[PDB]
Design a protein around this ligand. Sequence first.
Ligand SMILES: O=C(NCc1c(F)cc(F)cc1F)c1cn2c(c(O)c1=O)C(=O)N1[C@H]3CC[C@H](C3)O[C@@H]1C2
Ligand SMILES: O=C(NCc1c(F)cc(F)cc1F)c1cn2c(c(O)c1=O)C(=O)N1[C@H]3CC[C@H](C3)O[C@@H]1C2
Ligand SMILES: [Cl-]
Ligand SMILES: [Cl-]
Ligand SMILES: [Mg+2]
Ligand SMILES: [Mg+2]
Ligand SMILES: [Mg+2]
Ligand SMILES: [Mg+2]
Ligand SMILES: [Zn+2]
Ligand SMILES: [Zn+2]
Ligand SMILES: [Zn+2]
Ligand SMILES: [Zn+2]
Lengths: 270, 69, 270, 31, 252, 47
Amino acid sequence: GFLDGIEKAQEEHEKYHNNWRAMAEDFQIPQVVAKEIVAQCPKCQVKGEAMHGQVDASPKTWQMDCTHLEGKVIIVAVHVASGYIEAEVLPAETGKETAHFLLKLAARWPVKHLHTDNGDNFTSSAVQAVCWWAQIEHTFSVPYNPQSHGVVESMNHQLKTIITQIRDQAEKIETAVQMAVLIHNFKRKGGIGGYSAGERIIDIIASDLQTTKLQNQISKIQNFRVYFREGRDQQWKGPATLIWKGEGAVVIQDGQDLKVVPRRKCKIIK
Amino acid sequence: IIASDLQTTKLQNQISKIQNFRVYFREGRDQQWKGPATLIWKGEGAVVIQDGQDLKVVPRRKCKIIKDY
Amino acid sequence: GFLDGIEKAQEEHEKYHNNWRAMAEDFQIPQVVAKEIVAQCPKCQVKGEAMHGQVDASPKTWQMDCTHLEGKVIIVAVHVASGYIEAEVLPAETGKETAHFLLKLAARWPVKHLHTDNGDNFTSSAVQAVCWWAQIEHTFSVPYNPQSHGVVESMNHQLKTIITQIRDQAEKIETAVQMAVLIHNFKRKGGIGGYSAGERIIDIIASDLQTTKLQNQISKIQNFRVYFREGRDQQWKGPATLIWKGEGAVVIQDGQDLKVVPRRKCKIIK
Amino acid sequence: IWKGEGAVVIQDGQDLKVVPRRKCKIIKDYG
Amino acid sequence: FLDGIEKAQEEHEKYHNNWRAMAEDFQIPQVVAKEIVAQCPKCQSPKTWQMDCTHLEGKVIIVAVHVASGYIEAEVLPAETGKETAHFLLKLAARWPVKHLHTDNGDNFTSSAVQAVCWWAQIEHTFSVVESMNHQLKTIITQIRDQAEKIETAVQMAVLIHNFKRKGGIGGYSAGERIIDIIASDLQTTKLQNQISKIQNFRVYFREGRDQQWKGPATLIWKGEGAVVIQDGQDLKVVPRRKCKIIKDYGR
Amino acid sequence: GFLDGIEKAQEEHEKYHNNWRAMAEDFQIPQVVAKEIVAQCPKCQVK
DNA sequence: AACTGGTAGAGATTTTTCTTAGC
DNA sequence: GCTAAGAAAAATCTCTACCA
DNA sequence: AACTGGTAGAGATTTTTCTTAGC
DNA sequence: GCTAAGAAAAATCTCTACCA
Ligand SMILES: O=C(NCc1c(F)cc(F)cc1F)c1cn2c(c(O)c1=O)C(=O)N1[C@H]3CC[C@H](C3)O[C@@H]1C2
Ligand SMILES: O=C(NCc1c(F)cc(F)cc1F)c1cn2c(c(O)c1=O)C(=O)N1[C@H]3CC[C@H](C3)O[C@@H]1C2
Ligand SMILES: [Cl-]
Ligand SMILES: [Cl-]
Ligand SMILES: [Mg+2]
Ligand SMILES: [Mg+2]
Ligand SMILES: [Mg+2]
Ligand SMILES: [Mg+2]
Ligand SMILES: [Zn+2]
Ligand SMILES: [Zn+2]
Ligand SMILES: [Zn+2]
Ligand SMILES: [Zn+2]
């Protein structure tokens, strides 16, 4: 048998910390036992699970960060769904200047969600009062994880490369910062629609407003309710709103949730 | 009387085998690996763990979740 | 036409530094002209070509580097084709101790090619005299490019993880270094043949010697020369040595070069 | 098939090909 | 196939050949030839090292020698305590597979530090070749002494000349080629033994020609693509695969 | 882990001589080790 | 004119092996 | 006795951090 | 119990467009 | 007049460094 091999393998891992293939080959135990012996050791288990996530890309989400260049402090804000950049040079990295930059940005463009890191200027009472008055949801990243806001750190890189390209056409650094913002927003194309960033933010916000008005006018004159049968149990749920009846399935709304149900499990009543 | 205890032990066995997981995470400025903690919520990208009566949010790229057989 | 658009596009790139899609869309020139306008600018051209190379993996090649741990200086050497590790703790990072480590290594295992970085201990007259006496070819990497010796830096990582696993079983750091070398060489399996590193270096060197002796005995009694026709011009080359005649092609040796020629372009003479 | 000084001839899936010496590993592979 | 097995058994009954030669001659697989050797009543170390210390020019030289090949590893010690001997033994066991250590009844070899190292690395220590190796190393050291400044350089240069530059023995091999061939042959033996045990955990019910009934449980030796070799009644025989049933066996 | 389950199932089969599906469901060990426990007993047989 | 990224582990997906019920 | 469904155990494939 | 990597450019490979010779 | 070979120009796909 191999039960004595299981005991000798546990003593061997306690001294030498083998991996599972070494024990499964030298003691001739099955591989599930060797994997369990390794999985019950706390001196091992030093490795993550090797995947990446995906940030939020809603049409009113902004991300914000600070960078340094030639002894100055730049503050960068990016519109995530389009790539649109605003930037400024601060005299100090306090919370007063960050609150004023956020107030001017919220006065110019519609902001509803803001994502930042845990720096001392972004976790401040002045930024808290500005977000309260202008009705913004402020969310913070997991600490010491800059991948949670990857768009604004990538735009830090793009801004610094443009600034080194056009540095000899200006005298100060604030002039070169604003020239780099103009070159990024309007003079570089390529991406989703072949647009620049200014054309893309115009298209995204205009499309948002147009599609809300269109489907308000559609949904205010609707009828033809649908009773449908779904779930693990074959029950029947009540009044659902038919949205679009298609070649193969229908789309219903139930309790402010969108669902796609085929034609065999639904009945339409006028 | 006995049959009710059979049903209670079966239901408690399924409840205990649903969500008994351990988590080894990596956190802080100097990112070291720390001891076992209890999994609470698992979304795509990050997890919420309870360690020493403290709730922490760790990404799924910096933690290992060990199940049971 | 678009020739005036070409002139306006050159002035526009001189001021703003557009990419090629912006100029090709705003001035309606073909894309080859816009790519040429960007390619003649020296303020641009800041990007590599996005590939990787492949290091040498001959059966007698070694790579060497130094690392630091708890205020000490470790020196690591790796056999590249198998993954076999030797390591030591040096009292100083000079050239005398590096020459003595290389002399002991060359006395134990056959070394013919050594690859290092450009540190001050590896570019030294003592290491030069040891490589001269023991007949080793010493090659150095491109400066500030650690990817040229990736095997020894990866083994620096593996050694430090094992040392933190077994640190509480020893008192000093030299003891823990030698215990980590034993655990890496003999207690971890998985890889090319399911081997450990010690089994793999034994298999590689034994296979090298066996295959030289076998093909010496084969080639000392050979005959059946082959005249073949190849090249852009249909000429005929002289005496070539037939090695293996196969179903579809033959393998010949010409001027100590191996070639594979099909049957239609070769004639065998006994 | 044949091991040279700078090249190695192998048969791979009924295809004879020539690889450089620094891109090969020759094992007997007990297993 | 079966003709090869019959000729292999008759030739082993005459001359008692080894299994590598029988497999290469009679063109049978290695597990069958190893079973033919293992069934014979008359037919039933690569990891042993020796250590010693010596003196030269007021220094202490410690020498370890692989016995079956004559392979030398040497060093210069600053003292003769048990901690330095334990460090030399730990470095040696970390570089080569050491299973059995043979020494004499010195003080530094009979120590708690050496005992702790042998406990951790699982070596069998035995107290009682190295005299001949000390004499040979001292002759090479005196032969090349004018090329080195210190004694440590001359010691390691003599170890290199002993291991790779001197040829002798039967075929004219050095000590490094001999130690590599010995350890590689032992590795081939252990891998084949793992395959043999994993195959021999099965069982075979076979049906002979001109019958409908299954015979007794014969042990499977080799399971090919079209044929099956079994051991039954102290006899090795080849059955086609369409008259066989292989089932798992639990007879521990 | 199920290693304490392996030890407890060995004590339980030494008393009552269980089968392998019973031990694999009661002690939550994999089926191969439960079949090996039944195989090593000289009085029982896996079936 | 002759230089160069790699190693090992965590999960996910595909494949092979083993027991048992049905005809 | 033969065949197929089901599940367990093993093998392969893609992706990540760290190495001054 | 409600969190998360991304951006843009350098080459390689596949596809579409345009001129011209042959039947 | 119709059709196909050949080459130029455009479109798509995979892979890399840097962002405290
Ligand atoms: O950055 C280092 N490693 C990290 C790393 C890697 F390993 C592999 C990668 F693909 C990428 C990486 F980022 C690293 C740096 N240096 C040296 C190293 O050996 C070394 O590994 C070294 O010895 N010198 C000497 C020679 C001149 C002076 C002293 O500076 C250099 C600095
Ligand atoms: O390492 C940084 N970037 C590089 C990088 C990246 F951008 C994206 C990646 F996927 C990987 C990367 F390696 C980086 C570090 N820190 C901050 C940054 O904003 C920042 O970008 C920051 O603000 N703080 C404050 C909050 C607490 C204190 C001050 O330390 C942190 C340090
Ligand atoms: Cl942070
Ligand atoms: Cl360097
Ligand atoms: Mg920041
Ligand atoms: Mg940042
Ligand atoms: Mg270095
Ligand atoms: Mg290095
Ligand atoms: Zn462990
Ligand atoms: Zn330019
Ligand atoms: Zn015999
Ligand atoms: Zn029993």
